[PDB]
Structure 1
Amino acid sequence: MKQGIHPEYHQVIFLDTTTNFKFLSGSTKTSSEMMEWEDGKEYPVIRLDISSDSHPFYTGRQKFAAADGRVERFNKK
């Protein structure tokens, strides 16, 4: 690739918080949070509300509402 034209690119771990499922891939989201990975190096983490392993269409199961959500507050009521 040419130098100085492309946006900054780096490895990141997308973490589906619903299932606490982590997947490594490149992106340019540059989250401050850092986490360790099975390889010795550590890369920043991108929080993700819904993912392939959590979406109902992909999974075949009903999705689980997250904490502090609308459903949780409604049930607390």
Structure 2
Amino acid sequence: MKQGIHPEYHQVIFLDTTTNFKFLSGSTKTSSEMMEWEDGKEYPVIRLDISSDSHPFYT
């Protein structure tokens, strides 16, 4: 957590439409369009991906 060279991350609620895998983090300090409590009261801006929807193995 290299203080001295540490910017701010934050455990953001990556609330996607594909299962809402809001257990991620980063500097994605975006507007909490979904001010939820079960996940972080932060950006759900992770809108659509295929990591939880269309895998090449289990699509």
- Answer whether contact 1:16 1:50 (CA < 8 A) is retained: no
Q: Which has the higher strand share?
A: 1
Q: Give the superposed CA RMSD.
A: 3.8
Residue identity over aligned pairs, in percent, reads 100
Q: Which has the higher helix share?
A: 1
TM-score scaled by structure 1?
A: 0.38
Higher RCO (CA 8 Å, separation ≥ 6 residues): 2
TM-score scaled by structure 2?
A: 0.42
Q: How many corresponding residue pairs?
A: 59
Where structure 2 has 5 or more consecutive residues not aligned to the other structure, the ranges are none
The higher radius of gyration belongs to: 1
Deviation at 1:38, TM superposition (A): 1.9
Alignment CA distance shift 1:20-1:50 (3 Å) = same
